[PDB]
Symmetry: D2
Subunit: 328 residues, 4 copies
């Protein structure tokens, strides 16, 4: 037993649309326990010595900020910062935790500000975040009144980062991160909203990815798809021979207009391209909480409009779509 999912099993037991998940999830999490991870024991030892207990003040509306009305013990703060730095690299955020600023590789707040204006309100929505990272966006979703956020990300580190923030939130049961890939879910059709941001290009079968997302939505449910694109029309689709911006094992980089046709082909409606953004080195860079290489190292050193391999430089698109039917 690396990590006990008792609390999640309890939650989906008591939910008429997620209870069917109990037919496959428990054996998958049993298997995940037995594939020992080198670092997980160390990570857990550090997670366990993070302070337990509810903070006085939580902002998950405008940021992800935790504080106490009481200034914290100087020495307990120094320990906490050291524990959180154990979970390097911190890629998604930022977080402000009792005045500790976790300056993540990504300004994940900026992507959130690009998405929020275009989505159906999250008030009392159940949400699936596919490839949620450490779950930054799930906190922002609860900030907007979401009833339940389930994240899936196969990274052991991001489950520990998520549980660190969730413990510092006082053990909030309205968000959960499951160490799965999207390919491991059955057809649940349980969620009002599904996010898939930064996942499509990692999937060998892009149309199967779009069908797997459609299969998690209630009828009239909403998809937010975010992915790396190129410029062009409905037949502009980059598939790199080698790496794209130093990423291994990436596949399809369609144009936003191609992706819209793809979403229509698999049976989404009201498909809208709502945002295209050329990723600046201020949205993604090396920081003191993520000391590895980042976007500046992945660009042509003489031409920021190209990756080091010669392809057009990272461009992220947001599409919003509806699964057919009325939303009940």
């Amino acid at each position: 037993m690396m990590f006990n999912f008792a609390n999640f099993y309890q939650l989906i037991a008591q939910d008429t649309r997620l209870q069917p998940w109990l037919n496959v999830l428990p054996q998958q999490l049993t298997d995940w326990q037995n594939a020992e991870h080198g670092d997980f024991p160390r990570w857990l030892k550090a997670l366990n010595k993070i302070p337990e207990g509810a903070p006085d003040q939580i902002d998950i509306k405008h940021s992800v900020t935790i504080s106490n009305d009481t200034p914290f013990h100087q020495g307990e703060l120094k320990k906490l910062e050291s524990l959180l730095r154990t979970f390097h690299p911190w890629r998604k955020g930022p977080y402000t935790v009792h005045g500790i600023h976790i300056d993540t590789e990504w300004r994940s707040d900026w992507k959130w500000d690009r998405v929020l204006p275009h989505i159906s309100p999250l008030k009392n929505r159940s949400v699936l975040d596919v490839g949620c990272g450490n779950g930054y966006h799930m906190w922002r979703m609860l900030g907007e009144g979401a009833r339940l956020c389930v994240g899936i990300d196969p990274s052991h580190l991001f489950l520990i980062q998520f549980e660190a923030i969730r413990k510092l939130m006082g053990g909030d049961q309205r968000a959960h991160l499951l160490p799965l890939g999207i390919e491991q879910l059955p057809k649940l059709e349980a969620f009002d909203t599904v996010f898939s941001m930064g996942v499509l290009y990692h999937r060998r079968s892009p149309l199967d990815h779009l069908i797997q997302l459609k299969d998690q939505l209630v009828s009239g449910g909403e998809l937010i798809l975010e992915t790396l694109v190129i410029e062009g029309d409905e037949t502009a689709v980059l598939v790199p021979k080698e790496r794209y911006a130093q990423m291994r094992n990436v596949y399809f980089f369609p144009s936003a207009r191609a992706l819209k046709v793809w979403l229509e082909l698999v049976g989404f409606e009201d498909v809208r391209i709502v945002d295209e953004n050329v990723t600046s080195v201020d949205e993604q860079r090396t920081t003191n909480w993520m000391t590895h290489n980042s976007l500046p190292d992945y660009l042509d050193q003489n031409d920021p409009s190209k990756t080091v391999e010669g392809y057009p430089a990272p461009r992220r698109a947001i599409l919003v779509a509806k699964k057919p039917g009325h939303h009940h």
Copy 2:
């Protein structure tokens, strides 16, 4: 969805030894829901009409009796009696519920009085009742201070009877009836005590039945085995060509002395034959709550020492045994 097992899923989620059961149980219960039963909708409509409150007084020590301090509405009592009579036939009890006497085919209290003197105290024990009927003996086990009783019986009706009594008990979560056969359980090794009373003769493989029971016990756990026997030494074993006392699909009726050797062969220790009882027509008979044929109709009408088919008449034996190891 005939019946939602949400509350049982929640319980085993939070239990270190039963959580592994989530790896097979939910699909089995999903399959059970989809094998529609003719009567279950009617039964459920009646179960849902039974009053929802906690009663003021419960005796599960000396009987199974429920009452209120303030006498019930005269008309609400007549309705309750009608709802409970919906669940005909009532084979196992008796029960007294707000002065309504459920006069069951069996005096299940009499078997309980024969068993109780020979068992390890149930205080704080987790118990499995294999072939529990409507759960009569599970209430008596909670009466003796059992922490947890899980019953398994594949009868749809007995699940409805159990849930009727459990609702009238105020929704007591310390007992549960799962609509399974013992062959559907994985090796849990989770229970301090296991009861198998009246099951062994129904099982084609008696030694597999005994191993299945052993597989639900913690180290040093206690088995209570009760079954129909014949008289004789370690090599006396009736297997009827015909029916036995009108029962179809029955197999092994060993002597109590043979059954002791059987338990020893499969690896039980301290095996004790503690009681043999020739079933009288006062223990099992037709009543107003079970109007079908019963033991008097199954006996030779000229010789009550024989079944209608000519075999020795029903004789029940109780054996108690320990699974190897020290009991922690």
Copy 3:
């Protein structure tokens, strides 16, 4: 039992690289037998009436032509023509059988002439033809000295057409048609050459299709990939919203240059674009042996450079590639 695969089971039993196929194939063919097809009984009755002997003369080098030295009974020839016409529609050929000319929708000989100059000699090669139709090209592969041809096509009719020709060939055991999709094959790595001609656009996951092909090749084995393309560079990929040339359930129409990158990404080497051909209405048309609609009906009736839907008109490309390693 629609059709007994006894002879194929016998063949792979005695073959060191294909025997492992017996671990999944027989259940798949058992399942296929039990999904009754409306027409198969009629087809079989006609197949069984086709003469059983070996013919005196076979040309599978320059065409697929069968004849006898002594002219056939005038009346037996009229019966044979009637039996073969039972298997309408005849899409792939042509065939000449005892002077009966099967004028197929497709001039499959023309594709064969475009392919043959670019392939490694087939002498003593084992070959997989993926989506083989009635097996026309497998006869041409045996013509070129292939040791073994295994075809897979999920069409019931094309299995009957193949078995009709194979019976008229004298029951030649060097070619076989299995009623499977490529997704049903395990990783065999058993074949010197693999053909996939006209399949890729039908597959939702094009890169999975290419890996499935790679998984049937011995080390250093050769792939012949033929498919519908569009014009353009490495980022030209049509995915139609609509039908393409009246076809339902089609997906990816990359450029030949894009397809070369795709084959390189999934790990093929020495990838060569060897031919592009704009399909003329002389290559594919309605005939007396295939009386349904064909390419002329699928083209814009005012502009043969476009499909009826407005996309560029059918253009077929041939690519040849090697699986990594030396070919033993």
Copy 4:
């Protein structure tokens, strides 16, 4: 690959009643290959240097005797005897192989003479020998005109002994030994006759064993059941606490009369008890080809009517029964 079952797969491919076995057998034999056996490599090296080629003379009617019209090379005979002695212990026989007398622990010929008078003639019958040992009785079955004998025995040594005799028979394809237990067969209903001799007492579930035998028979098919019994009526059934005659992991020793009721309960007809034999120390003993302990060591040294443990001494019964239906 310990042993290649190519020839068996070929045979059941071409048999309409055994072909369905290909749905499960190949994965089971693949798994059996990968459970490496310490001795199998050595055994195989010795099997491979046994002379290949047909003998001139075979008696499988009155014994199992192989000879050449030509007396054999003195030195080749010395090598052969040494190779065959590699496969110690030789429990079932005897065999006479080019004048080499393999004096087996058991006089298996004597059991054959007790069985033969009572069975339906084997001429053109397909036969299953369940727990066939090295396949001695399958040779005697072919001697009586059996068309096909399939043996199953999970002992790696007995498969090597069988292949040694089968190679010395010239590679006779009418008999085969599969390294399986009876529990691994699906319901084939393929065999005219089934033998189960010396197996029932090794099976934890005796009634499941009798059903598994019934499941291998064509309708109107014949069972020969042979097993260790006690004396007594329909309720005489020994189940030993410990060992019986030094055997570990044995279960039910019913009387012949009990076993007859058991066969009727599971649905056999025309059940006849045809022979009971108290095993003499001349039927089973230590020999120069089986140097381990044997029946004399397993008996009370002062009372040959008892096993060393005190139970009645070995008594073997033969029952013959019919599966319901007419035999087509």
